[PDB]
């Protein structure tokens, strides 16, 4: 048991790597997207802004027209440590991308709604002058 | 010295333990973020396109007054 | 014989009797038959009717199915077999007993005299073959018997018929 | 030796980092989930405006 | 509410009005009415799980939409039809997509064009099993992504290209791609750690070169000893480079067996490693 | 619902629902129909080497679900499972199963009840697992005075 633990747990330290390494792989796909999506939402936000503009004009037109075993076991830890730093790297990129976009969602939701109203009002004045 | 060798193991496992679970989270993570990634691929679609629907409307309205 | 269809044992009560449960519209309790699975696999069991068995099918217990290598829903041929009370009369049959389920294994003592007494009081006038596997209900405890040798009333026979004056070891 | 009994918290601390990382992302899911029902539903009304604006074009233009 | 009825009415209205029925003004509205019809049909065909019918229906509403002069919302339909045929039983899945890209592409929409371009190269591989055509698409698509300053997506595609390129036979053309995707990865400290596997793959890929392209590629890599991420990359490679430069198919196959402990090998690696195993055996009884 | 998701290319969501279906299906006696659902969701998960990752648990659940079969449906399901000992994820799926199959295919009820006590360490047993594990612990006992 004594050795079945100083080695088995040692295998866990070795595994402790792929465990925190597979996490990076899982983090990459996330970050890679969070970044890709970040730029996407930029062109997406343009939509809420593009519509925000046109609607103003559209409304006006509708208004104008409407009217050594332990030595290694100690090293593996250092390995985990070096990787722990990485976990911080992603934790920040993921964090700064989350907070920057959440607030972006706010602006999107705002303008989107603001324009929704203009569409409804215009749709109630246009539907009548149909055909 | 035995005492230190046994106490060592005790702390090592308690360590090994906390580890395995943290790994469990990323697994579920990659399954969540991805499940959300597809929920945005349609957004970008419905957005830049809605810009076309609105653009076509604002254009027709202008050429309906001049 | 008539093509029959293997089935599962109705209740657990008949699952501890080591008897092929059949219907009352085909055979009758007390008769013996010889199941045929292939040109080189002949087995002999004891019948025991039950108002649950469907006409044209014979139900076997878990142990039996493992011994005779039977499957639930396979075609088998059953033919009436008549024992010869002149050479198949068991008088001394050695049995290899052991805990059926390794789930409940104890080191408690089990009086053999009481076993051989309840053994014949439940497995009388039945067919037993060498190497056969079954279950023995002794004091709400399940076991796994395995016939090793059978002696008539000394010629060692392959298959015999336990009677009232049958000794068991 | 001591590194073992020590490094133990070097991860228990991260186990907390992800605990928030898993939550942060999930919080965005709901923010984008609702935005998915108000943004898509938004253009839905735009479709009504595209049809209305198209007809006002075949009558006054 | 019957699809079969709608498909008929649509037809009755989708046709360049003739005689008095035409007059002066065309049927730019009629063609649209038909589009709405077929759309409604494809719709109920999708709730019925008749997929095939749903897809072909969308194809109808789409083609007609083109006959109306509205490439945008048309292409959108082409996509809908693709999503139908894909999760369906007939074909057309590949056709609808190509018919969608020709539109997003000539309309000024490359972002979404590449979005469907990769989907295409993905189907032409996981279905049609046409690797050579899929690579061509994964590539042309990565060009667009990389143009939309979406380096992230670009590499996502390049990895596919090289990845399956090493599987076909193109080991060299694979490493070149790994070199490019490797140089354009360091500019982002968010891929440093991942930039390892790239060097591992590129060093593993061999186009039957006699020099030390690998011994050189491993040297180009920057590693020390207190690095643990790097432990799953070149450290192994060197051992493999020595087992190859010594025609010992017993040290290579043993080292792969050891490394397969600290870092589980995947299908890709397995296949290539065995290829290198055979080049060695093939150098021994040689 | 999962059918609709499965037609919108959205694989994730589709599986999300399927898991619910089979999950509550085995908790209603529909053990076999459950393993089948796990087989489908297991096949439509390997196509994506990004799901290889969760594709374990499915085999564990499916191997646990038993429609009272007398053959080795589970010993076979665990076999179909591709695993490598040095691996980790995998050690959290079949490894336990094998030990459970031996405790069942061997008719022993201490080793199963103790192995479920050990696995509960490296991997916490959720509600589902618990309920079913007890059902098997009872198929053992039920098999016992049988």
From Swiss-Prot, chain B:
Phylogenetic placement of the source organism: Eukaryota, Metazoa, Chordata, Craniata, Vertebrata
Cross-linked sites for Glycyl lysine isopeptide (Lys-Gly) (interchain with G-Cter in SUMO): 62-63, 66
Annotated function: Plays an essential role in hormone and neurotransmitter calcium-dependent exocytosis and endocytosis. Part of the SNARE (Soluble NSF Attachment Receptor) complex composed of SNAP25, STX1A and VAMP2 which mediates the fusion of synaptic vesicles with the presynaptic plasma membrane. STX1A and SNAP25 are localized on the plasma membrane while VAMP2 resides in synaptic vesicles. The pairing of the three SNAREs from the N-terminal SNARE motifs to the C-terminal anchors leads to the formation of the SNARE complex, which brings membranes into close proximity and results in final fusion.
Family of this protein: Belongs to the syntaxin family.
Summary of the tissues where the protein is detected: Expressed predominantly in cerebral cortex, hippocampus, cerebellum, adrenal medulla and retina with weak expression detected in non-neuronal tissues.
Name of the protein: Syntaxin-1A
Ranges of residues in domain t-SNARE coiled-coil homology: 2-64
Subcellular localization, as worded in the UniProt entry: Cytoplasmic vesicle, Secretory vesicle, Synaptic vesicle membrane; Cell membrane; Synapse, Synaptosome
Organism encoding this protein: Rattus norvegicus
UniProtKB/Swiss-Prot annotation, chain C:
Coiled coil: none
N6-acetyllysine: modified positions: 103
Cellular localization per UniProt: Cytoplasm
Family: Belongs to the AAA ATPase family.
Subunit structure of this chain's protein: Homohexamer. Interacts with GABARAP and GABARAPL2. Interacts with GRIA2. Interacts with PLK2, leading to disrupt the interaction with GRIA2. Interacts with MUSK; may regulate MUSK endocytosis and activity. Interacts with CDK16.
Function of the molecule: Required for vesicle-mediated transport. Catalyzes the fusion of transport vesicles within the Golgi cisternae. Is also required for transport from the endoplasmic reticulum to the Golgi stack. Seems to function as a fusion protein required for the delivery of cargo proteins to all compartments of the Golgi stack independent of vesicle origin. Interaction with AMPAR subunit GRIA2 leads to influence GRIA2 membrane cycling.
Name under which the protein is recorded: Vesicle-fusing ATPase
Species for this entry: Cricetulus griseus
Lineage of the organism: Eukaryota, Metazoa, Chordata, Craniata, Vertebrata
Gene: NSF
Full-protein positions shown: 3 to 184 of 744
UniProtKB/Swiss-Prot annotation, chain D:
Residue ranges occupied by any v-SNARE coiled-coil homology domain in the UniProt entry: 3-61
Cytoplasmic side: 1-61
Tissue: Nervous system specific. A higher level expression is seen in the brain as compared to the spinal cord. Expressed in hippocampal neurons.
GO MF annotation: an example: SNAP receptor activity
Modifications after synthesis and translation: Phosphorylated by PRKCZ in vitro and this phosphorylation is increased in the presence of WDFY2. (Microbial infection) Targeted and hydrolyzed by C.botulinum neurotoxin type B (BoNT/B, botB) which hydrolyzes the 76-Gln-|-Phe-77 bond and inhibits neurotransmitter release.
Topology in the lipid bilayer: Single-pass type IV membrane protein
Family that this chain belongs to: Belongs to the synaptobrevin family.
Name of this chain's protein: Vesicle-associated membrane protein 2
Species of origin: Rattus norvegicus (Rat)
Residues of the full protein shown: 29 to 89 of 116
Swiss-Prot record, chain F:
Protein family (similarity comment): Belongs to the SNAP family.
Cell compartments where the protein resides: Cell membrane
Organism this protein belongs to: Rattus norvegicus
Organism phylogeny: Eukaryota, Metazoa, Chordata, Craniata, Vertebrata
Underlying gene: Napa
Residue numbers bearing the Phosphoserine modification: 48
Name listed for the protein in its UniProt record: Alpha-soluble NSF attachment protein
Assembly behavior: Interacts with PRKCABP, and disrupts the interaction between GRIA2 and PRKCABP, leading to the internalization of GRIA2. Found in a complex with VAMP8. Component of a SNARE-like complex that contains at least ZW10, USE1L, RINT1, STX18 and NAPA/SNAP-alpha. Interacts with VTI1A. Interacts with STX12. Interacts with GNA12 (via N-terminus); the interaction promotes CDH5 localization to plasma membrane.
Functional summary from the UniProt entry: Required for vesicular transport between the endoplasmic reticulum and the Golgi apparatus. Together with GNA12 promotes CDH5 localization to plasma membrane.
């Amino acid at each position: 048991r004594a050795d079945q633990l100083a080695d088995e747990s040692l295998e866990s330290t070795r595994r402790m790597l792929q465990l925190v390494e597979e996490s990076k792989d899982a983090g990459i796909r996330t970050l890679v997207m969070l970044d890709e999506q970040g730029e996407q939402l930029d062109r997406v936000e343009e939509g809420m802004n593009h519509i925000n503009q046109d609607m103003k004009e559209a409304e006006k037109n509708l208004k104008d027209l409407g009217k050594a075993r332990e030595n290694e076991m100690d090293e593996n830890l250092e390995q985990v440590s070096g990787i722990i730093g990485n976990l911080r790297h992603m934790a920040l990129d993921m964090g700064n991308e989350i907070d920057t976009q959440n607030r972006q969602i706010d602006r999107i939701m705002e303008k989107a709604d603001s324009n929704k109203t203009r569409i409804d009002e215009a749709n109630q004045r246009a539907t009548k002058m149909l055909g | 010295a035995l005492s230190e060798i046994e106490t060592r193991h005790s702390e090592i496992i308690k360590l090994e333990n906390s580890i395995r679970e943290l790994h469990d989270m990323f697994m579920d993570m990659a399954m969540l973020v991805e499940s959300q990634g597809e929920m945005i691929d349609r957004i970008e679609y419905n957005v830049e396109h809605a810009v076309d629907y609105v653009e076509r409307a604002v254009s027709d309205t202008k050429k309906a007054v001049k | 014989g008539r093509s029959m269809q293997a089935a599962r044992c109705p209740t657990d009560e008949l699952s501890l009797s080591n008897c092929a449960v059949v219907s009352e519209k085909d055979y009758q309790s007390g008769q013996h038959v010889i199941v045929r699975t292939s040109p080189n696999h002949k087995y002999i069991f004891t019948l025991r009717t039950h108002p649950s068995v469907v006409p044209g099918s014979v139900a076997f217990s878990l142990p039996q199915r493992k011994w005779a290598g039977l499957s639930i829903g396979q075609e088998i041929e059953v033919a009436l077999y008549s024992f010869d009370k002149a050479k198949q009369c068991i008088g001394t049959m050695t049995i290899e007993i052991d805990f059926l389920q390794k789930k409940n294994i104890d080191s408690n003592p089990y009086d053999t005299d009481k076993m051989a007494a309840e053994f014949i009081q439940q497995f009388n006038n039945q067919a037993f073959s060498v190497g056969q596997q079954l279950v023995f209900s002794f004091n709400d405890k399940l076991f796994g018997l395995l016939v090793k040798d059978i002696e008539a009333m000394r010629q060692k026979i392959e298959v015999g018929l336990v009677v009232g004056n049958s000794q068991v070891a | 030796n001591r590194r073992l009994q020590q490094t133990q918290a070097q991860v228990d601390e991260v186990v907390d980092i992800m605990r928030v990382n898993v939550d942060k992302v999930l919080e965005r899911d709901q923010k984008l989930s609702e935005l998915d029902d108000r943004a898509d539903a938004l253009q839905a009304g735009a479709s009504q405006f595209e049809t209305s604006a198209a007809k006002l074009k075949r009558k006054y233009w | 509410a019957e699809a079969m009825a709608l498909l008929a009415e649509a037809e009755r209205k989708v046709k360049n009005s003739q005689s008095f029925f035409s007059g002066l003004f065309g049927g730019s509205s009629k063609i649209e009415e038909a589009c709405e019809i077929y759309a409604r049909a494809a719709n109920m065909f999708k709730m019925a799980k008749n997929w095939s019918a749903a897809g072909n229906a969308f194809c109808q509403a789409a083609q007609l939409h083109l006959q109306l002069q509205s490439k945008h919302d048309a292409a959108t339909c082409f996509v809908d039809a693709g999503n139908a045929f894909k999760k369906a039983d007939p074909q057309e899945a590949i056709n609808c997509l190509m018919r969608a890209i020709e539109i997003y592409t000539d309309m000024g929409r490359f972002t979404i064009a590449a979005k469907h371009h990769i989907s295409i190269a993905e189907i032409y591989e996981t279905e049609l099993v046409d690797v050579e055509k899929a690579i061509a698409h994964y590539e042309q698509s990565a060009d667009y992504y990389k143009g939309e300053e979406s380096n992230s997506s670009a590499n996502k595609c390049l990895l596919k290209v090289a990845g399956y390129a090493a599987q076909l036979e193109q080991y060299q053309k694979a490493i070149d791609i790994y070199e490019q995707v490797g140089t354009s990865a360091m500019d982002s400290p968010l891929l440093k750690y991942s930039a390892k596997d790239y060097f591992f793959k590129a060093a593993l890929c061999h186009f039957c070169i006699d020099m030390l392209n690998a011994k050189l590629a491993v040297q180009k890599y920057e590693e020390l000893f207190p690095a643990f991420s790097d432990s799953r990359e070149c450290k192994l490679m060197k051992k493999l480079l020595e087992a190859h430069e010594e025609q010992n198919v017993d040290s290579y196959t043993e080292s792969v067996k050891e490394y397969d402990s600290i870092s589980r090998l995947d299908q890709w690696l397995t296949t290539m490693l065995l290829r290198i195993k055979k080049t060695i055996q093939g150098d021994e009884e040689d």
